[PDB]
RNA sequence: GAGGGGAGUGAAAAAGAACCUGAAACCGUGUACGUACAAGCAGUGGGAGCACGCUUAGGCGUGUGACUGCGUACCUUUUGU
RNA sequence: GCACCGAAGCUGCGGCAGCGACGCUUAUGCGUUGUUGGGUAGGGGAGCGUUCUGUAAGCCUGCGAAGGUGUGCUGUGAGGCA
C-alpha cells in the first residue's frame, strides 16, 4: 500500500528513577 | 500376552454390613479402605473400582484409644477471612457422628477422581438398622 | 489344558494350538522344537514343579517364522549441557505355534 | 556453489511435526514448540520402558497377595514357601493363574504351605 | 495491564460461547393483508391489526 | 443438486458475517429469507443477496423448484485484509486491518 | 453495481487475469471419539469404552482416550536454575 | 530371629560396537570367549544429505522430471528406496 512510515520514538518517556 | 485388566463394565462388587461398635476406628478404616478399593481380589487394576459396597452401623459407638476421644483435633478451613474451624473427637461424635468414620477412611482411599468414586460405595449410618434391605448386605467381621 | 515353560529368560503360560512370541531361537523356519524346561502343566488337576521342571514334561512346537519388532526410539537428552543422542532399535523374535503339551 | 537449503529444511521440520501428531495446541502445530514436545516424549518413554517392568511386577505382586490371603496366607510366607518348596522357580506374572485358575492357585498355596510346615 | 501469555485459540472460542444470535420465531400474520411482520409493528404496506393506517 | 453461489472480498470481518450465517445453516430456504429479513445486521443483507443469488442459480441453471430447497452448507472463510495506517499519537503507527470475507452459500435439496 | 452461477475457449478454468508450482504460521465448514465433581510443562507407561476396518473369531490395524503410575518446557549463563 | 518389598546395581534371554586372546581361517571374516561402552570443556575416529564439475551425446523422464502431500518398507543415526 503506500502505507509505510514508522518514526518510533525513544522509549516513550514519563517517570522512573528507581532509588538509588 | 498382556496380563489381565479388570473392566468397569464387568466387575462384581456385592454388599456388606459392618458393626462399628466396640471396634477401634482406623483399624476398622484400614479394612474398609482396603475392601473399598478392591485390594482383596483381582484388585489387579489400579485404574478400576473393584471394591465392594459396604455399610457401617453404630458409627456413634465407634472406639478410639488413648485420650484421643477428648484430644483428637479434626480441623477444617472455611476458605474465608480467617475461618479455621476445629472440633474435638467427642464434639464430632456428638453432632453427625457418621463423619468420624467417613473422613477417617476418605483419608485412606486414594487421591483423586477414582478415589472419590470409591468413597461413594460406603454407607455409614449413625444408628443400628439401615434402609438398604434391598441390597441384601452380607455381614462381615473385622 | 495349559502348561507354562521357560524360554526367553522368561516364562509363558500356553495352551496348545496357541501361537506365542519368543526371544529369537536358532532354529530353521519350519523345523520343530522341544522345550524340556516346563514349570507346570494343568488339566483337571495339575503338576507343579517339585524342583523346577516337571519330570515327564515337554512342550513341542514348530517355529513359524522369525522377525523383527516395531522400531523403538531411544532418546537421550541433557538439558543445558549441550548433549543429546537419539538411537533406533528393533529386536529380533521367532514365533512358534505350539502343538505338544505332553502332560 | 550456492546451496538453496530449505527443501531439506522442511524435511527436517515435517519429520518432527509428524511425531507430534496428537499433542495439544502448539505442541502439534508449531515446530519450535513441537521439537521440544517430541524430545520429552522420547525422554519419558526411555524412562518408562524401565518403569513398565516395575509397575507390572508390583501389579502382579499385589494380586498374588490377595489370592494368597484368600487362601489364608500372606505373600511373604507364600513366596518363601515356593522358594523352599524344594527349589522350584516360577514367575510372579505367571502367577497369572491367580485370576484365571483359582484351584491351580490354591493348589500352589498348599505346595508352599507344606514346605513351611 | 497486559497478558503474560498468548490466550489460546480454544480460550477465544470459549469466551464466545455467549456471543451467538437468536432468530425471531415471533413473526406473525396480518388479519387483512397477507403480510408477515414483527408483532405489534406496522406491515410493509401499512396494515396493522387488519386496519389500513399509513397510506405509505 | 448442490448448486452454490458466493460473494468474494465482501467488506466485513467474517467473525461478523458468521453469526448471521450460523442462523441459516440447515434451514429451508423459505425460512432463511424471513430470518434474514428481520435480523438487524449488515451481514444479514450481505448473506441474503448471496442466498438469493444462489436460489436464482439453482432455479435458472439446474433443476429449480425452490420450495423443496434448503441451505445445506454455508460457511465464510476469511479473505485478504486491506492494510491501512492511522496514527495515534506521537507518531506511532497503527496498522488497522480492514478485514474482508468470502461468503459462500450452498443451497441444495438432499 | 461489487461479486457470483451457467455457457463457451483450451490439454488443463481445480491455468480467469487477486492467473505455473501453491509449503508453513493463521481462520473456518463437515464427520468420529472425548469433555459440564474436576486442579498443575499437558506428555509418557498402563488402559477400558466408542467409531471404524480386519480376520473367520481369537484381548488385531486406525482414530479417539474415561480412569490410572510417573512427570516443573527449551536455550543460555552458572557452584547451582 | 526368620521372612518379604525394593534400583537403570547383580543374574538371566536376545542384540550392537572397541580391545583381547583361542579356535575355524589369513587382498580376512567367522565362531566362540574374557573384557569395555554415563559424560560438559575438549581431543580422536567414521559417516548422512544438500549445491556445483567430470564420468554423461550415458542413464531416468509427457506411458509424467523437479517441487508439494500422503502411504509402505528399510538403516544405529544423519537418511534411503518404493
Ligand atoms: N518511562 C520511560 C523512562 C524514562 C524516564 N525519563 C525518560 C526520558 C526520555 C525517554 C524515556 C524516559 C521508559 O519507559 O523507558
Ligand atoms: N525519579 C522520580 C522523578 C522522575 C520522573 N521521571 C524521571 C526521569 C528522570 C529522572 C527523574 C524522573 C520518579 O520517578 O518519581
Ligand atoms: Mg528392574
Ligand atoms: Mg505530530
Ligand atoms: Mg495459480
Ligand atoms: Mg463426570
Ligand atoms: Mg485447571
Ligand atoms: Mg489435588
Ligand atoms: Mg549467580
Ligand atoms: Mg561450569
Ligand atoms: Mg532442576
Ligand atoms: Mg549416555
Ligand atoms: Mg536439484
Short mmCIF file of N, CA, C and O in Angstrom, two decimals, chain F residues 7-110:
data_model
loop_
_atom_site.label_atom_id
_atom_site.label_comp_id
_atom_site.label_asym_id
_atom_site.label_seq_id
_atom_site.Cartn_x
_atom_site.Cartn_y
_atom_site.Cartn_z
N UNK F 7 -20.05 -14.53 -2.60
CA UNK F 7 -19.66 -13.13 -2.57
C UNK F 7 -18.21 -13.03 -2.11
O UNK F 7 -17.93 -13.29 -0.95
N UNK F 8 -17.29 -12.66 -2.99
CA UNK F 8 -15.87 -12.61 -2.61
C UNK F 8 -15.42 -11.18 -2.28
O UNK F 8 -15.92 -10.23 -2.86
N UNK F 9 -14.51 -11.03 -1.33
CA UNK F 9 -14.00 -9.71 -0.94
C UNK F 9 -15.11 -8.80 -0.40
O UNK F 9 -15.12 -7.59 -0.61
N UNK F 10 -16.06 -9.39 0.31
CA UNK F 10 -17.05 -8.59 0.99
C UNK F 10 -16.40 -7.77 2.11
O UNK F 10 -15.50 -8.26 2.80
N UNK F 11 -16.85 -6.53 2.30
CA UNK F 11 -16.36 -5.73 3.41
C UNK F 11 -17.12 -6.06 4.68
O UNK F 11 -18.21 -5.53 4.95
N UNK F 12 -16.55 -7.00 5.43
CA UNK F 12 -16.95 -7.33 6.78
C UNK F 12 -15.91 -8.32 7.26
O UNK F 12 -15.10 -8.80 6.45
N UNK F 13 -15.93 -8.67 8.54
CA UNK F 13 -14.78 -9.38 9.10
C UNK F 13 -14.76 -10.88 8.80
O UNK F 13 -13.69 -11.44 8.50
N UNK F 14 -15.94 -11.49 8.89
CA UNK F 14 -16.14 -12.95 8.87
C UNK F 14 -16.69 -13.33 10.22
O UNK F 14 -17.77 -13.90 10.31
N UNK F 15 -15.92 -13.05 11.27
CA UNK F 15 -16.44 -13.16 12.63
C UNK F 15 -17.84 -12.56 12.72
O UNK F 15 -18.71 -13.12 13.36
N UNK F 16 -18.02 -11.41 12.07
CA UNK F 16 -19.30 -10.74 11.99
C UNK F 16 -20.25 -11.41 11.05
O UNK F 16 -21.45 -11.45 11.32
N UNK F 17 -19.74 -11.90 9.92
CA UNK F 17 -20.61 -12.47 8.88
C UNK F 17 -21.17 -13.78 9.41
O UNK F 17 -22.39 -14.00 9.41
N UNK F 18 -20.28 -14.65 9.87
CA UNK F 18 -20.65 -15.76 10.73
C UNK F 18 -21.46 -15.10 11.82
O UNK F 18 -21.19 -13.95 12.13
N UNK F 19 -22.40 -15.80 12.42
CA UNK F 19 -23.37 -15.28 13.41
C UNK F 19 -24.64 -15.07 12.66
O UNK F 19 -25.70 -15.44 13.13
N UNK F 20 -24.52 -14.52 11.46
CA UNK F 20 -25.67 -14.37 10.59
C UNK F 20 -25.76 -15.64 9.78
O UNK F 20 -26.85 -16.19 9.60
N UNK F 21 -24.62 -16.11 9.29
CA UNK F 21 -24.58 -17.38 8.60
C UNK F 21 -25.13 -18.50 9.50
O UNK F 21 -26.00 -19.27 9.10
N UNK F 22 -24.66 -18.53 10.74
CA UNK F 22 -24.98 -19.62 11.66
C UNK F 22 -26.48 -19.74 11.93
O UNK F 22 -26.95 -20.81 12.32
N UNK F 23 -27.23 -18.66 11.73
CA UNK F 23 -28.69 -18.68 11.91
C UNK F 23 -29.39 -19.44 10.80
O UNK F 23 -30.56 -19.83 10.92
N UNK F 24 -28.70 -19.60 9.69
CA UNK F 24 -29.33 -20.02 8.46
C UNK F 24 -28.91 -21.46 8.15
O UNK F 24 -29.64 -22.19 7.51
N UNK F 25 -27.74 -21.87 8.63
CA UNK F 25 -27.22 -23.19 8.30
C UNK F 25 -28.24 -24.31 8.57
O UNK F 25 -28.62 -24.56 9.71
N UNK F 26 -28.70 -24.92 7.49
CA UNK F 26 -29.62 -26.05 7.56
C UNK F 26 -31.11 -25.78 7.39
O UNK F 26 -31.88 -26.73 7.29
N UNK F 27 -31.55 -24.52 7.28
CA UNK F 27 -32.99 -24.25 7.21
C UNK F 27 -33.53 -24.42 5.80
O UNK F 27 -32.77 -24.48 4.84
N UNK F 28 -34.85 -24.53 5.70
CA UNK F 28 -35.50 -24.44 4.41
C UNK F 28 -35.24 -23.02 3.94
O UNK F 28 -35.34 -22.09 4.73
N UNK F 29 -34.91 -22.86 2.67
CA UNK F 29 -34.60 -21.54 2.12
C UNK F 29 -35.66 -20.53 2.49
O UNK F 29 -35.36 -19.42 2.96
N UNK F 30 -36.91 -20.95 2.33
CA UNK F 30 -38.07 -20.12 2.65
C UNK F 30 -37.92 -19.41 4.00
O UNK F 30 -38.10 -18.20 4.09
N UNK F 31 -37.56 -20.17 5.04
CA UNK F 31 -37.43 -19.61 6.38
C UNK F 31 -36.28 -18.62 6.47
O UNK F 31 -36.46 -17.52 6.97
N UNK F 32 -35.13 -19.02 5.95
CA UNK F 32 -33.94 -18.18 5.99
C UNK F 32 -34.22 -16.75 5.53
O UNK F 32 -33.89 -15.79 6.24
N UNK F 33 -34.84 -16.61 4.37
CA UNK F 33 -35.20 -15.30 3.84
C UNK F 33 -35.95 -14.47 4.89
O UNK F 33 -35.65 -13.30 5.08
N UNK F 34 -36.92 -15.08 5.56
CA UNK F 34 -37.66 -14.38 6.61
C UNK F 34 -36.70 -14.06 7.76
O UNK F 34 -36.69 -12.94 8.28
N UNK F 35 -35.92 -15.05 8.17
CA UNK F 35 -34.97 -14.87 9.26
C UNK F 35 -34.05 -13.70 8.99
O UNK F 35 -33.89 -12.83 9.84
N UNK F 36 -33.44 -13.70 7.80
CA UNK F 36 -32.51 -12.65 7.45
C UNK F 36 -33.24 -11.33 7.44
O UNK F 36 -32.71 -10.29 7.83
N UNK F 37 -34.49 -11.39 7.00
CA UNK F 37 -35.23 -10.17 6.76
C UNK F 37 -35.43 -9.43 8.06
O UNK F 37 -35.50 -8.21 8.05
N UNK F 38 -35.50 -10.14 9.18
CA UNK F 38 -35.72 -9.47 10.47
C UNK F 38 -34.53 -9.58 11.41
O UNK F 38 -34.69 -9.58 12.63
N UNK F 39 -33.34 -9.58 10.82
CA UNK F 39 -32.09 -9.67 11.57
C UNK F 39 -31.27 -8.42 11.32
O UNK F 39 -30.63 -8.31 10.27
N UNK F 40 -31.26 -7.51 12.29
CA UNK F 40 -30.68 -6.18 12.10
C UNK F 40 -29.16 -6.16 12.07
O UNK F 40 -28.54 -5.59 12.94
N UNK F 41 -28.57 -6.77 11.05
CA UNK F 41 -27.13 -6.72 10.86
C UNK F 41 -26.75 -6.62 9.40
O UNK F 41 -27.25 -7.37 8.56
N UNK F 42 -25.78 -5.77 9.13
CA UNK F 42 -25.29 -5.54 7.78
C UNK F 42 -24.96 -6.88 7.14
O UNK F 42 -25.19 -7.07 5.95
N UNK F 43 -24.42 -7.81 7.92
CA UNK F 43 -24.05 -9.12 7.38
C UNK F 43 -25.29 -9.87 6.93
O UNK F 43 -25.18 -10.83 6.16
N UNK F 44 -26.45 -9.51 7.47
CA UNK F 44 -27.69 -10.13 7.03
C UNK F 44 -27.98 -9.75 5.59
O UNK F 44 -28.32 -10.60 4.76
N UNK F 45 -27.80 -8.48 5.25
CA UNK F 45 -28.15 -8.08 3.92
C UNK F 45 -27.20 -8.75 2.98
O UNK F 45 -27.61 -9.21 1.92
N UNK F 46 -25.95 -8.86 3.39
CA UNK F 46 -24.95 -9.50 2.55
C UNK F 46 -25.35 -10.92 2.30
O UNK F 46 -25.53 -11.32 1.15
N UNK F 47 -25.48 -11.69 3.38
CA UNK F 47 -25.84 -13.09 3.26
C UNK F 47 -27.11 -13.28 2.44
O UNK F 47 -27.22 -14.23 1.68
N UNK F 48 -28.06 -12.36 2.57
CA UNK F 48 -29.29 -12.50 1.83
C UNK F 48 -28.97 -12.48 0.34
O UNK F 48 -29.24 -13.46 -0.37
N UNK F 49 -28.36 -11.40 -0.13
CA UNK F 49 -28.01 -11.26 -1.54
C UNK F 49 -27.33 -12.50 -2.11
O UNK F 49 -27.54 -12.87 -3.26
N UNK F 50 -26.53 -13.16 -1.28
CA UNK F 50 -25.83 -14.35 -1.72
C UNK F 50 -26.82 -15.49 -1.81
O UNK F 50 -26.85 -16.20 -2.81
N UNK F 51 -27.61 -15.66 -0.77
CA UNK F 51 -28.62 -16.70 -0.75
C UNK F 51 -29.56 -16.52 -1.92
O UNK F 51 -29.88 -17.46 -2.63
N UNK F 52 -30.00 -15.29 -2.14
CA UNK F 52 -30.89 -15.05 -3.25
C UNK F 52 -30.19 -15.43 -4.55
O UNK F 52 -30.76 -16.16 -5.36
N UNK F 53 -28.95 -14.97 -4.74
CA UNK F 53 -28.21 -15.28 -5.96
C UNK F 53 -28.10 -16.78 -6.14
O UNK F 53 -28.09 -17.28 -7.27
N UNK F 54 -28.02 -17.49 -5.03
CA UNK F 54 -27.90 -18.95 -5.06
C UNK F 54 -29.18 -19.62 -5.54
O UNK F 54 -29.14 -20.48 -6.41
N UNK F 55 -30.31 -19.19 -4.99
CA UNK F 55 -31.59 -19.72 -5.41
C UNK F 55 -31.75 -19.52 -6.92
O UNK F 55 -31.92 -20.48 -7.67
N UNK F 56 -31.66 -18.28 -7.36
CA UNK F 56 -31.78 -17.97 -8.77
C UNK F 56 -30.84 -18.82 -9.57
O UNK F 56 -31.19 -19.26 -10.64
N UNK F 57 -29.65 -19.09 -9.04
CA UNK F 57 -28.77 -20.01 -9.73
C UNK F 57 -29.47 -21.34 -9.81
O UNK F 57 -29.78 -21.82 -10.89
N UNK F 58 -29.80 -21.90 -8.65
CA UNK F 58 -30.38 -23.23 -8.60
C UNK F 58 -31.58 -23.28 -9.53
O UNK F 58 -31.83 -24.28 -10.21
N UNK F 59 -32.29 -22.17 -9.59
CA UNK F 59 -33.50 -22.12 -10.37
C UNK F 59 -33.20 -22.16 -11.88
O UNK F 59 -33.48 -23.13 -12.57
N UNK F 60 -32.56 -21.10 -12.35
CA UNK F 60 -32.29 -20.92 -13.76
C UNK F 60 -31.24 -21.85 -14.38
O UNK F 60 -31.28 -22.07 -15.58
N UNK F 61 -30.35 -22.42 -13.58
CA UNK F 61 -29.24 -23.22 -14.13
C UNK F 61 -29.35 -24.73 -13.95
O UNK F 61 -28.92 -25.49 -14.81
N UNK F 62 -29.84 -25.15 -12.79
CA UNK F 62 -30.04 -26.57 -12.53
C UNK F 62 -31.54 -26.76 -12.41
O UNK F 62 -32.31 -25.89 -12.84
N UNK F 63 -31.94 -27.86 -11.78
CA UNK F 63 -33.34 -28.20 -11.61
C UNK F 63 -34.28 -27.04 -11.31
O UNK F 63 -35.04 -26.64 -12.19
N UNK F 64 -34.22 -26.54 -10.07
CA UNK F 64 -35.02 -25.42 -9.54
C UNK F 64 -36.00 -25.97 -8.53
O UNK F 64 -35.67 -26.87 -7.77
N UNK F 65 -37.22 -25.44 -8.52
CA UNK F 65 -38.23 -25.81 -7.55
C UNK F 65 -37.71 -25.40 -6.18
O UNK F 65 -37.17 -26.22 -5.43
N UNK F 66 -37.87 -24.13 -5.87
CA UNK F 66 -37.22 -23.56 -4.70
C UNK F 66 -37.90 -24.09 -3.46
O UNK F 66 -37.29 -24.19 -2.39
N UNK F 67 -39.15 -24.49 -3.62
CA UNK F 67 -39.95 -24.83 -2.47
C UNK F 67 -39.29 -25.99 -1.74
O UNK F 67 -39.12 -25.94 -0.53
N UNK F 68 -38.88 -27.02 -2.48
CA UNK F 68 -38.06 -28.06 -1.87
C UNK F 68 -36.58 -27.75 -2.09
O UNK F 68 -35.93 -28.32 -2.95
N UNK F 69 -36.06 -26.85 -1.26
CA UNK F 69 -34.71 -26.34 -1.42
C UNK F 69 -34.23 -25.76 -0.08
O UNK F 69 -34.83 -24.82 0.45
N UNK F 70 -33.14 -26.31 0.44
CA UNK F 70 -32.62 -25.97 1.76
C UNK F 70 -31.20 -25.48 1.66
O UNK F 70 -30.45 -25.86 0.76
N UNK F 71 -30.81 -24.65 2.63
CA UNK F 71 -29.44 -24.16 2.69
C UNK F 71 -28.63 -25.20 3.45
O UNK F 71 -28.57 -25.18 4.67
N UNK F 72 -28.06 -26.14 2.71
CA UNK F 72 -27.46 -27.33 3.32
C UNK F 72 -26.06 -27.13 3.84
O UNK F 72 -25.62 -27.84 4.73
N UNK F 73 -25.36 -26.17 3.25
CA UNK F 73 -23.97 -25.91 3.58
C UNK F 73 -23.67 -24.42 3.43
O UNK F 73 -23.81 -23.89 2.33
N UNK F 74 -23.23 -23.76 4.49
CA UNK F 74 -22.88 -22.34 4.42
C UNK F 74 -21.76 -22.01 5.35
O UNK F 74 -21.79 -22.33 6.53
N UNK F 75 -20.77 -21.32 4.81
CA UNK F 75 -19.59 -21.01 5.56
C UNK F 75 -19.04 -19.71 5.05
O UNK F 75 -19.43 -19.26 3.98
N UNK F 76 -18.12 -19.11 5.80
CA UNK F 76 -17.45 -17.91 5.34
C UNK F 76 -16.01 -18.00 5.76
O UNK F 76 -15.71 -18.15 6.93
N UNK F 77 -15.11 -17.97 4.78
CA UNK F 77 -13.68 -18.04 5.02
C UNK F 77 -13.17 -16.62 5.06
O UNK F 77 -13.72 -15.75 4.42
N UNK F 78 -12.11 -16.37 5.81
CA UNK F 78 -11.62 -15.00 5.93
C UNK F 78 -10.77 -14.66 4.72
O UNK F 78 -9.84 -15.37 4.38
N UNK F 79 -11.09 -13.54 4.09
CA UNK F 79 -10.39 -13.11 2.89
C UNK F 79 -9.10 -12.35 3.13
O UNK F 79 -8.60 -12.33 4.24
N UNK F 80 -8.55 -11.76 2.06
CA UNK F 80 -7.35 -10.94 2.21
C UNK F 80 -7.73 -9.71 3.01
O UNK F 80 -8.89 -9.34 2.93
N UNK F 81 -6.82 -9.12 3.77
CA UNK F 81 -7.17 -7.96 4.55
C UNK F 81 -6.41 -6.73 4.11
O UNK F 81 -5.21 -6.77 3.90
N UNK F 82 -7.14 -5.63 3.94
CA UNK F 82 -6.57 -4.38 3.47
C UNK F 82 -5.88 -3.66 4.61
O UNK F 82 -6.53 -3.21 5.54
N UNK F 83 -4.56 -3.55 4.51
CA UNK F 83 -3.78 -2.82 5.49
C UNK F 83 -3.95 -1.32 5.30
O UNK F 83 -3.90 -0.85 4.17
N UNK F 84 -4.15 -0.56 6.36
CA UNK F 84 -4.18 0.91 6.26
C UNK F 84 -3.27 1.51 7.31
O UNK F 84 -2.45 0.78 7.85
N UNK F 85 -3.35 2.81 7.57
CA UNK F 85 -2.50 3.38 8.61
C UNK F 85 -3.22 4.43 9.39
O UNK F 85 -3.85 5.32 8.82
N UNK F 86 -3.15 4.62 10.65
CA UNK F 86 -3.80 5.84 11.04
C UNK F 86 -2.88 6.00 12.07
O UNK F 86 -2.39 5.01 12.46
N UNK F 87 -3.07 6.99 12.85
CA UNK F 87 -2.00 7.25 13.75
C UNK F 87 -2.58 7.63 15.02
O UNK F 87 -3.59 8.21 15.02
N UNK F 88 -1.97 7.28 16.09
CA UNK F 88 -2.49 7.56 17.37
C UNK F 88 -1.26 8.08 17.66
O UNK F 88 -0.42 7.92 16.89
N UNK F 89 -1.13 8.80 18.73
CA UNK F 89 -0.36 9.93 18.68
C UNK F 89 0.77 10.10 19.57
O UNK F 89 0.92 9.55 20.55
N UNK F 90 1.64 10.87 19.01
CA UNK F 90 3.02 10.78 18.98
C UNK F 90 3.01 10.02 17.71
O UNK F 90 2.09 9.33 17.44
N UNK F 91 4.03 10.11 16.88
CA UNK F 91 3.99 9.49 15.57
C UNK F 91 4.23 8.12 16.04
O UNK F 91 5.10 7.96 16.79
N UNK F 92 3.35 7.20 15.70
CA UNK F 92 3.28 5.88 16.31
C UNK F 92 2.09 5.26 15.62
O UNK F 92 0.94 5.65 15.84
N UNK F 93 2.37 4.29 14.76
CA UNK F 93 1.56 4.00 13.65
C UNK F 93 0.84 2.80 14.03
O UNK F 93 1.28 2.16 14.92
N UNK F 94 -0.29 2.53 13.44
CA UNK F 94 -1.18 1.60 13.97
C UNK F 94 -1.38 1.00 12.69
O UNK F 94 -1.44 1.72 11.81
N UNK F 95 -1.43 -0.31 12.54
CA UNK F 95 -1.75 -0.96 11.28
C UNK F 95 -3.19 -0.83 10.90
O UNK F 95 -3.51 -0.27 9.86
N UNK F 96 -4.08 -1.28 11.78
CA UNK F 96 -5.51 -1.43 11.44
C UNK F 96 -5.70 -2.23 10.13
O UNK F 96 -5.32 -1.83 9.04
N UNK F 97 -6.30 -3.40 10.27
CA UNK F 97 -6.60 -4.25 9.14
C UNK F 97 -8.08 -4.15 8.80
O UNK F 97 -8.93 -4.52 9.62
N UNK F 98 -8.41 -3.63 7.62
CA UNK F 98 -9.79 -3.68 7.18
C UNK F 98 -10.01 -5.07 6.64
O UNK F 98 -9.58 -5.39 5.54
N UNK F 99 -10.62 -5.92 7.45
CA UNK F 99 -10.65 -7.33 7.13
C UNK F 99 -11.79 -7.59 6.20
O UNK F 99 -12.80 -6.91 6.27
N UNK F 100 -11.61 -8.58 5.32
CA UNK F 100 -12.63 -8.96 4.36
C UNK F 100 -12.96 -10.43 4.50
O UNK F 100 -12.21 -11.17 5.14
N UNK F 101 -14.04 -10.85 3.85
CA UNK F 101 -14.54 -12.21 3.98
C UNK F 101 -15.12 -12.73 2.67
O UNK F 101 -15.61 -11.97 1.84
N UNK F 102 -15.05 -14.04 2.51
CA UNK F 102 -15.51 -14.75 1.35
C UNK F 102 -16.77 -15.51 1.73
O UNK F 102 -16.68 -16.65 2.19
N UNK F 103 -17.93 -14.89 1.58
CA UNK F 103 -19.19 -15.58 1.89
C UNK F 103 -19.48 -16.68 0.88
O UNK F 103 -19.19 -16.49 -0.29
N UNK F 104 -20.03 -17.82 1.30
CA UNK F 104 -20.35 -18.90 0.36
C UNK F 104 -21.60 -19.64 0.78
O UNK F 104 -21.64 -20.18 1.87
N UNK F 105 -22.59 -19.74 -0.11
CA UNK F 105 -23.85 -20.44 0.19
C UNK F 105 -24.13 -21.58 -0.75
O UNK F 105 -24.23 -21.39 -1.96
N UNK F 106 -24.27 -22.77 -0.19
CA UNK F 106 -24.62 -23.94 -0.99
C UNK F 106 -26.04 -24.34 -0.69
O UNK F 106 -26.33 -24.81 0.41
N UNK F 107 -26.92 -24.21 -1.67
CA UNK F 107 -28.32 -24.46 -1.43
C UNK F 107 -28.77 -25.61 -2.31
O UNK F 107 -28.96 -25.44 -3.51
N UNK F 108 -28.96 -26.77 -1.71
CA UNK F 108 -29.39 -27.96 -2.42
C UNK F 108 -30.75 -28.41 -1.93
O UNK F 108 -31.56 -27.59 -1.49
N UNK F 109 -31.01 -29.72 -2.01
CA UNK F 109 -32.27 -30.27 -1.53
C UNK F 109 -32.16 -31.69 -0.98
O UNK F 109 -33.18 -32.30 -0.66
N UNK F 110 -30.93 -32.21 -0.88
CA UNK F 110 -30.68 -33.53 -0.27
C UNK F 110 -29.31 -33.62 0.42
O UNK F 110 -28.98 -34.62 1.06
#
